[PDB]
CSV table of C-alpha atoms in Angstrom, one decimal:
chain,number,residue,atom,x,y,z
A,1,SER,CA,18.8,-24.5,106.9
A,2,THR,CA,19.7,-21.0,108.1
A,3,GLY,CA,18.8,-17.4,107.3
A,4,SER,CA,20.6,-14.1,107.8
A,5,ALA,CA,19.1,-10.6,107.3
A,6,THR,CA,20.3,-7.1,108.0
A,7,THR,CA,18.1,-5.0,110.1
A,8,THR,CA,18.3,-1.2,109.8
A,9,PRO,CA,17.1,1.6,112.1
A,10,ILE,CA,14.2,3.6,110.6
A,11,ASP,CA,15.5,6.9,111.8
A,12,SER,CA,18.4,8.6,113.6
A,13,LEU,CA,17.1,7.7,117.1
A,14,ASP,CA,16.8,4.0,116.4
A,15,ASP,CA,13.0,4.2,117.1
A,16,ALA,CA,12.6,0.9,115.4
A,17,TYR,CA,14.4,-1.5,113.0
A,18,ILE,CA,13.2,-2.8,109.6
A,19,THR,CA,14.3,-6.0,108.0
A,20,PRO,CA,13.5,-6.9,104.3
A,21,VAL,CA,11.2,-9.9,104.0
A,22,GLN,CA,10.3,-11.7,100.7
A,23,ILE,CA,6.6,-12.5,100.4
A,24,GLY,CA,4.9,-14.4,97.5
A,25,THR,CA,5.8,-15.5,94.0
A,26,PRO,CA,7.3,-13.6,92.4
A,27,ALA,CA,8.8,-12.1,95.5
A,28,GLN,CA,7.3,-9.0,97.0
A,29,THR,CA,9.8,-7.4,99.4
A,30,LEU,CA,8.4,-5.6,102.4
A,31,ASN,CA,10.4,-4.0,105.2
A,32,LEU,CA,9.0,-5.5,108.4
A,33,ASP,CA,9.5,-4.7,112.1
A,34,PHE,CA,10.7,-7.9,113.7
A,35,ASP,CA,8.9,-8.0,117.1
A,36,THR,CA,9.8,-10.6,119.7
A,37,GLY,CA,6.9,-9.1,121.8
A,38,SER,CA,4.1,-10.3,119.4
A,39,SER,CA,3.2,-13.2,117.3
A,40,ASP,CA,1.4,-11.9,114.2
A,41,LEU,CA,3.0,-11.5,110.8
A,42,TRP,CA,0.9,-8.7,109.3
A,43,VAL,CA,1.4,-6.4,106.3
A,44,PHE,CA,0.2,-3.3,104.6
A,45,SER,CA,-1.7,-4.6,101.5
A,46,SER,CA,-3.9,-4.0,98.6
A,47,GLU,CA,-6.8,-4.5,101.0
A,48,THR,CA,-5.7,-1.8,103.4
A,49,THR,CA,-8.0,1.2,103.6
A,50,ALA,CA,-6.6,3.6,101.1
A,51,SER,CA,-6.7,6.7,103.4
A,52,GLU,CA,-4.6,4.7,105.9
A,53,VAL,CA,-1.7,4.0,103.5
A,54,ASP,CA,0.9,6.8,103.3
A,55,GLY,CA,4.1,5.6,101.6
A,56,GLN,CA,4.3,2.0,102.7
A,57,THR,CA,5.0,-0.8,100.3
A,58,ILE,CA,2.0,-3.1,100.1
A,59,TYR,CA,1.6,-6.8,99.6
A,60,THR,CA,-0.8,-7.6,96.8
A,61,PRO,CA,-1.9,-11.3,97.1
A,62,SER,CA,-3.6,-11.3,93.7
A,63,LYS,CA,-0.1,-10.9,92.1
A,64,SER,CA,1.3,-13.9,94.0
A,65,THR,CA,0.8,-17.3,92.3
A,66,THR,CA,1.4,-19.0,95.7
A,67,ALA,CA,-1.1,-16.8,97.8
A,68,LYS,CA,-4.2,-18.6,99.0
A,69,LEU,CA,-6.9,-17.0,101.1
A,70,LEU,CA,-7.2,-18.7,104.5
A,71,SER,CA,-11.0,-18.9,104.3
A,72,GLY,CA,-12.9,-17.4,107.3
A,73,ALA,CA,-9.8,-16.3,109.1
A,74,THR,CA,-9.5,-12.8,110.6
A,75,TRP,CA,-7.1,-11.1,113.0
A,76,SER,CA,-7.1,-8.0,115.2
A,77,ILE,CA,-4.3,-6.9,117.5
A,78,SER,CA,-3.6,-4.1,119.9
A,79,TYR,CA,-0.1,-3.1,121.0
A,80,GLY,CA,1.3,-1.9,124.3
A,81,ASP,CA,1.7,1.6,122.8
A,82,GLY,CA,-2.0,1.8,121.9
A,83,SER,CA,-1.6,1.2,118.2
A,84,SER,CA,-3.7,-1.5,116.4
A,85,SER,CA,-4.4,-3.2,113.1
A,86,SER,CA,-6.8,-5.9,111.7
A,87,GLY,CA,-7.8,-7.7,108.6
A,88,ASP,CA,-8.0,-11.1,106.9
A,89,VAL,CA,-5.3,-13.8,106.2
A,90,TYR,CA,-3.5,-15.5,103.3
A,91,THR,CA,-1.0,-18.3,103.3
A,92,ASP,CA,2.1,-17.7,101.2
A,93,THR,CA,5.7,-18.3,100.8
A,94,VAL,CA,7.9,-16.1,103.1
A,95,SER,CA,11.7,-15.8,103.0
A,96,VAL,CA,14.0,-14.0,105.5
A,97,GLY,CA,17.6,-13.8,104.6
A,98,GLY,CA,17.5,-16.9,102.4
A,99,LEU,CA,15.4,-19.0,104.8
A,100,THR,CA,12.1,-20.0,103.2
A,101,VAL,CA,8.8,-21.0,104.9
A,102,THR,CA,5.9,-22.2,102.7
A,103,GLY,CA,2.3,-21.9,103.9
A,104,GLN,CA,3.1,-19.0,106.3
A,105,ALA,CA,0.1,-17.1,107.5
A,106,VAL,CA,0.4,-13.5,106.1
A,107,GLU,CA,-2.1,-11.3,107.8
A,108,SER,CA,-3.4,-8.8,105.4
A,109,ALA,CA,-4.4,-5.4,107.0
A,110,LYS,CA,-7.7,-4.0,106.1
A,111,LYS,CA,-7.3,-1.3,108.9
A,112,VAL,CA,-4.4,0.2,110.7
A,113,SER,CA,-4.2,2.9,113.4
A,114,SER,CA,-2.8,6.3,112.8
A,115,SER,CA,0.7,5.6,114.2
A,116,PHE,CA,1.2,2.8,111.5
A,117,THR,CA,-0.1,5.1,108.7
A,118,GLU,CA,2.2,7.9,109.8
A,119,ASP,CA,5.3,5.7,109.7
A,120,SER,CA,6.0,5.2,106.0
A,121,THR,CA,9.1,3.2,106.7
A,122,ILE,CA,7.4,0.2,108.3
A,123,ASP,CA,5.4,-2.1,105.9
A,124,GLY,CA,4.2,-4.4,108.7
A,125,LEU,CA,5.4,-6.5,111.7
A,126,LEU,CA,6.9,-10.0,111.9
A,127,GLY,CA,6.0,-11.5,115.3
A,128,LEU,CA,8.7,-13.6,117.1
A,129,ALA,CA,7.1,-14.2,120.5
A,130,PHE,CA,5.3,-17.5,121.1
A,131,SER,CA,2.5,-18.6,118.8
A,132,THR,CA,0.1,-18.8,121.7
A,133,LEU,CA,-0.2,-15.0,121.4
A,134,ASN,CA,-1.2,-15.1,117.7
A,135,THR,CA,-4.5,-13.3,117.1
A,136,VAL,CA,-5.8,-15.2,114.0
A,137,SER,CA,-9.4,-16.6,114.6
A,138,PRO,CA,-10.9,-19.1,114.5
A,139,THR,CA,-7.7,-21.0,113.9
A,140,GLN,CA,-4.6,-19.7,115.5
A,141,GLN,CA,-1.5,-19.5,113.3
A,142,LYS,CA,2.1,-20.1,113.9
A,143,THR,CA,4.9,-17.6,113.7
A,144,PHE,CA,7.5,-17.6,111.0
A,145,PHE,CA,10.1,-18.9,113.5
A,146,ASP,CA,7.7,-21.7,114.7
A,147,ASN,CA,7.2,-22.8,111.1
A,148,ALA,CA,10.9,-22.7,110.3
A,149,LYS,CA,12.1,-24.3,113.5
A,150,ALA,CA,12.2,-28.0,112.5
A,151,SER,CA,14.2,-27.2,109.3
A,152,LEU,CA,16.7,-25.0,111.1
A,153,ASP,CA,20.2,-26.4,111.8
A,154,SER,CA,19.6,-25.3,115.5
A,155,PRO,CA,16.2,-24.1,116.8
A,156,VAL,CA,17.4,-20.6,117.6
A,157,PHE,CA,17.3,-17.1,116.2
A,158,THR,CA,19.6,-14.2,117.3
A,159,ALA,CA,19.1,-10.4,117.5
A,160,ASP,CA,22.2,-8.2,117.0
A,161,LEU,CA,20.8,-4.6,117.0
A,162,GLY,CA,23.0,-1.8,116.2
A,163,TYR,CA,23.4,1.6,117.8
A,164,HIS,CA,22.8,4.2,115.1
A,165,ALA,CA,23.8,1.5,112.7
A,166,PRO,CA,22.6,-1.7,110.9
A,167,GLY,CA,22.6,-5.1,112.6
A,168,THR,CA,21.5,-8.6,112.0
A,169,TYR,CA,18.8,-11.2,112.6
A,170,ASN,CA,20.1,-14.7,112.1
A,171,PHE,CA,18.0,-17.9,112.1
A,172,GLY,CA,19.3,-21.4,112.8
A,173,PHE,CA,22.8,-20.6,113.9
A,174,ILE,CA,24.8,-18.6,116.4
A,175,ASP,CA,27.6,-16.4,114.8
A,176,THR,CA,30.5,-16.8,117.2
A,177,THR,CA,32.3,-13.9,115.5
A,178,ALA,CA,29.4,-11.5,116.4
A,179,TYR,CA,30.1,-11.2,120.1
A,180,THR,CA,32.9,-11.0,122.7
A,181,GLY,CA,33.4,-13.3,125.7
A,182,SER,CA,30.8,-15.9,126.4
A,183,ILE,CA,27.0,-16.1,126.0
A,184,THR,CA,25.2,-16.3,129.4
A,185,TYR,CA,22.0,-18.2,129.2
A,186,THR,CA,19.1,-17.7,131.5
A,187,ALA,CA,15.6,-19.3,132.0
A,188,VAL,CA,12.5,-18.2,130.1
A,189,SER,CA,8.9,-18.4,131.1
A,190,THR,CA,6.5,-18.8,128.3
A,191,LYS,CA,3.4,-18.6,130.6
A,192,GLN,CA,2.5,-15.1,129.2
A,193,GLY,CA,3.6,-15.9,125.6
A,194,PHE,CA,6.6,-13.8,125.9
A,195,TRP,CA,10.4,-14.2,126.0
A,196,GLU,CA,10.1,-13.6,129.7
A,197,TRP,CA,13.2,-13.8,132.0
A,198,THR,CA,14.5,-12.5,135.3
A,199,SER,CA,17.5,-10.1,135.4
A,200,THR,CA,19.7,-10.4,138.5
A,201,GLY,CA,20.1,-6.6,139.1
A,202,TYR,CA,21.4,-3.4,138.0
A,203,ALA,CA,24.0,-0.7,138.4
A,204,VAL,CA,24.0,3.1,137.5
A,205,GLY,CA,27.2,4.4,135.9
A,206,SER,CA,30.2,3.4,138.0
A,207,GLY,CA,28.0,2.7,141.0
A,208,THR,CA,27.8,-0.6,142.8
A,209,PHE,CA,25.7,-3.4,141.5
A,210,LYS,CA,22.3,-3.9,143.2
A,211,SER,CA,21.3,-7.6,143.3
A,212,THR,CA,17.6,-7.8,142.8
A,213,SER,CA,15.3,-9.9,140.6
A,214,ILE,CA,13.7,-8.0,137.8
A,215,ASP,CA,11.2,-10.0,135.7
A,216,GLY,CA,10.8,-8.7,132.2
A,217,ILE,CA,10.5,-9.5,128.5
A,218,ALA,CA,13.0,-9.3,125.8
A,219,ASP,CA,11.1,-7.2,123.2
A,220,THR,CA,12.7,-6.1,120.0
A,221,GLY,CA,9.6,-4.3,119.1
A,222,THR,CA,9.7,-1.8,121.9
A,223,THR,CA,12.1,1.1,121.6
A,224,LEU,CA,12.9,1.9,125.2
A,225,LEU,CA,13.9,0.2,128.4
A,226,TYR,CA,11.0,0.0,130.9
A,227,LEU,CA,11.8,-0.9,134.5
A,228,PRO,CA,10.4,-0.5,138.0
A,229,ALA,CA,10.0,3.1,139.2
A,230,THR,CA,12.6,2.5,142.0
A,231,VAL,CA,15.2,1.5,139.4
A,232,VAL,CA,14.4,4.3,137.0
A,233,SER,CA,14.4,7.0,139.8
A,234,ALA,CA,17.9,5.8,140.9
A,235,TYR,CA,19.1,6.2,137.3
A,236,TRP,CA,17.8,9.6,136.6
A,237,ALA,CA,18.8,10.9,140.1
A,238,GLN,CA,22.4,10.8,138.7
A,239,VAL,CA,21.6,13.2,135.9
A,240,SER,CA,21.5,16.9,137.0
A,241,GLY,CA,18.2,18.4,136.0
A,242,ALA,CA,16.4,15.3,135.0
A,243,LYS,CA,12.8,14.9,136.0
A,244,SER,CA,9.6,13.0,135.3
A,245,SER,CA,7.2,15.0,133.2
A,246,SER,CA,3.5,13.9,133.1
A,247,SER,CA,3.0,16.5,130.2
A,248,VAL,CA,5.8,14.9,128.1
A,249,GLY,CA,5.0,11.4,129.2
A,250,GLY,CA,8.1,10.3,131.1
A,251,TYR,CA,11.6,11.3,132.2
A,252,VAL,CA,13.3,14.2,130.4
A,253,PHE,CA,16.7,15.6,130.9
A,254,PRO,CA,18.8,18.6,129.8
A,255,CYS,CA,20.1,17.9,126.3
A,256,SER,CA,23.4,19.4,127.7
A,257,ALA,CA,23.9,16.4,130.0
A,258,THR,CA,26.3,13.6,129.8
A,259,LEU,CA,24.3,10.5,130.6
A,260,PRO,CA,25.7,7.7,132.8
A,261,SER,CA,25.8,4.1,131.6
A,262,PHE,CA,23.2,1.5,132.9
A,263,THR,CA,24.2,-2.1,133.7
A,264,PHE,CA,21.8,-5.0,133.9
A,265,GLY,CA,22.5,-8.5,135.2
A,266,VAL,CA,22.1,-11.8,133.3
A,267,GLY,CA,22.9,-14.4,135.9
A,268,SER,CA,26.4,-13.6,137.0
A,269,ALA,CA,27.1,-11.7,133.8
A,270,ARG,CA,26.7,-7.9,133.2
A,271,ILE,CA,25.5,-6.1,130.1
A,272,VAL,CA,26.5,-2.4,129.9
A,273,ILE,CA,24.3,0.1,128.1
A,274,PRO,CA,26.4,3.1,127.3
A,275,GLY,CA,24.9,6.4,128.3
A,276,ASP,CA,24.5,7.6,124.7
A,277,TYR,CA,22.1,4.8,124.1
A,278,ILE,CA,19.7,6.3,126.5
A,279,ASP,CA,19.5,9.7,124.7
A,280,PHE,CA,16.4,9.9,122.5
A,281,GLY,CA,16.9,13.6,121.7
A,282,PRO,CA,14.8,16.8,121.9
A,283,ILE,CA,11.2,16.2,123.0
A,284,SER,CA,10.3,18.6,120.1
A,285,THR,CA,12.4,20.1,117.3
A,286,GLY,CA,14.7,22.7,118.7
A,287,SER,CA,14.0,21.9,122.5
A,288,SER,CA,16.8,21.7,125.0
A,289,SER,CA,14.8,19.1,126.9
A,290,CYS,CA,15.7,15.6,125.8
A,291,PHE,CA,13.7,12.4,126.2
A,292,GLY,CA,15.1,9.6,128.3
A,293,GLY,CA,15.6,6.0,127.1
A,294,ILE,CA,15.0,4.4,130.5
A,295,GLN,CA,11.4,4.9,131.6
A,296,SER,CA,9.1,3.6,134.3
A,297,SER,CA,7.1,0.4,133.7
A,298,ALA,CA,4.6,1.4,136.4
A,299,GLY,CA,1.2,1.1,134.8
A,300,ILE,CA,2.4,-1.1,131.9
A,301,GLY,CA,2.1,-4.1,134.1
A,302,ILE,CA,5.4,-5.6,132.9
A,303,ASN,CA,9.0,-4.6,132.6
A,304,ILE,CA,10.4,-4.5,129.1
A,305,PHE,CA,13.9,-5.0,127.9
A,306,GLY,CA,13.4,-3.1,124.6
A,307,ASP,CA,15.9,-2.0,122.0
A,308,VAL,CA,17.8,0.3,124.4
A,309,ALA,CA,18.8,-2.8,126.3
A,310,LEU,CA,18.9,-5.4,123.6
A,311,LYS,CA,21.1,-3.4,121.2
A,312,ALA,CA,23.9,-3.4,123.9
A,313,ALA,CA,24.1,-7.2,123.5
A,314,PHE,CA,24.1,-10.1,121.2
A,315,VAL,CA,20.9,-12.0,122.2
A,316,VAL,CA,20.1,-15.6,121.6
A,317,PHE,CA,16.4,-16.6,121.4
A,318,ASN,CA,16.7,-20.3,122.0
A,319,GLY,CA,13.5,-22.1,120.9
A,320,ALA,CA,14.5,-25.6,122.1
A,321,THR,CA,11.8,-27.7,123.9
A,322,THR,CA,12.6,-25.7,127.0
A,323,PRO,CA,13.3,-22.2,125.7
A,324,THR,CA,16.0,-20.0,127.1
A,325,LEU,CA,17.6,-16.6,126.4
A,326,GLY,CA,21.3,-15.9,126.0
A,327,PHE,CA,23.1,-12.6,126.3
A,328,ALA,CA,26.7,-11.7,125.3
A,329,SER,CA,28.5,-8.4,125.2
A,330,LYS,CA,29.8,-7.3,121.8
């Protein structure tokens, strides 16, 4: 089997991407944030505290003839950005782009933090990191990909995120028309439950490539690119007037600037992030100070290849017995 679904930016900055997901019988379609940095599939639901729902589409398990309470199971998750959610668990039929999993754990939110409430466009998350991170207790549950894997033509999914435009998540096959040149594959460590890999270095604009190992995670659920302070300082030093602002919470730059590109290494290959991808617009409406899309990972504890990086590539998440990651230009 295979699946193929379009993923769409939630706003004009590509702050996140939503992908339609069919849950239950008859189908209830929710727009979920596919997140390769976590491993819970959770949804706004009929059980979500009413004051914490503001425009989201909810899953109502009582209206699904295939929903079954997973007795005794609860979940609770906290994300790197400080947001959180928790609730109980149903199993139900879940389909993504024509690919169907029966008996998928659908984690029903009883509580969500304010950032989720305030984002009416995201109806929940669909985790695509390794199932070892799944938060369901007392019986850990498998991700959608884990459950689908054996049925897939090939045990892979791919992320093809658009810049200010829709893109695609494919399951079970590699679309050879979706990228240019060849795919370069690189080793993955699953020791932290992430799609963790080591970049071979970077360049700023037309500058020379610096060979240096940068360990980080491929995370579709993080907006920006978070890298060591040395790397990030080198990038923003090439933008006149750029500075790190503690009050804003990162590097800002004059909105009048032309940003340089940023290149990262995948083995001997090179992925180029155009400068425009690194512009996240005025810090507040009407401001001439703009927020940077490359930020320091210092104090996160891990480097994160988020959407800013991933949307510059066609990315293969290879879930073979020994997982690997592939990157191609496009």
